[PDB]
């Protein structure tokens, strides 16, 4: 991974994002969503992630 004082920054771009494989992976100890509740991610489109 990358340090905390120089974090990394990847600019995900045009593709097909499946936040369900993330949301249900049960391997994450913390999964908070703020602007938008998690289950409605696989039904919206943005400009950049």
């Amino acid at each position: 991974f990358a340090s905390v004082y120089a974090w990394n920054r990847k600019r995900i771009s045009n593709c097909v994002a499946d936040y369900s494989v993330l949301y249900n992976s049960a391997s994450f100890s913390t999964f908070k969503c703020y602007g938008v509740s998690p289950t409605k991610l696989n039904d919206l489109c943005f400009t950049n992630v």
């Binding site: 949301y23 249900n24 049960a26 999964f31 998690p38 289950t39």
Partner: protein, 49 residues
């Protein structure tokens, strides 16, 4: 110190009909995994204060 006696519901299956009222306290189920009345990931208590 905080008045924690004023709660509100923050998860429901479907929006209310007008003038409809819902005082149940069942454990919400966000993900597909069944909850069986215990908390956990994607199994949330539905009332906040």
């Amino acid at each position: 110190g905080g008045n924690y006696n004023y709660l509100y519901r923050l998860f429901r299956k479907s929006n209310l009909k007008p003038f409809e009222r819902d005082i149940s306290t069942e454990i919400y189920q966000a993900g597909s995994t069944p909850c069986n009345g215990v908390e956990g990931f994607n199994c949330y208590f539905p009332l906040q204060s």
